[PDB]
Tab-separated table of N, CA and C in Angstrom:
chain	number	residue	atom	x	y	z
A	1	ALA	N	0.320	-0.957	-0.413
A	1	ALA	CA	0.267	0.348	0.414
A	1	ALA	C	0.917	1.200	0.498
A	2	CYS	N	0.641	2.475	-0.572
A	2	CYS	CA	1.126	3.153	-0.805
A	2	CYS	C	0.265	5.547	0.729
A	3	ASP	N	1.078	4.785	0.922
A	3	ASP	CA	0.223	6.351	1.478
A	3	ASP	C	0.775	7.340	2.167
A	4	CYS	N	1.673	6.959	3.127
A	4	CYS	CA	2.612	8.172	2.582
A	4	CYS	C	4.972	7.324	3.307
A	5	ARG	N	5.038	6.867	2.954
A	5	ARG	CA	5.685	5.113	2.887
A	5	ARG	C	6.252	4.683	2.063
A	6	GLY	N	5.475	3.975	0.715
A	6	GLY	CA	6.328	2.886	0.012
A	6	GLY	C	6.867	4.630	-0.863
A	7	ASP	N	5.598	4.890	-2.893
A	7	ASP	CA	5.592	5.335	-3.131
A	7	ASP	C	5.364	6.845	-2.846
A	8	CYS	N	5.370	6.961	-1.259
A	8	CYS	CA	4.842	8.394	-1.117
A	8	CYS	C	5.449	8.559	0.250
A	9	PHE	N	5.218	9.846	1.055
A	9	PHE	CA	5.905	10.247	2.141
A	9	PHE	C	5.719	10.394	3.415
A	10	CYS	N	6.150	10.078	4.775
A	10	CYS	CA	5.227	10.725	5.609
A	10	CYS	C	5.663	12.147	6.502
A	11	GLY	N	6.890	11.893	5.758
A	11	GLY	CA	7.359	13.608	6.023
A	11	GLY	C	9.205	13.122	5.759
């Protein structure tokens, strides 16, 4: 999944 870690970033 991608929320903010896979191909997305939580910061």
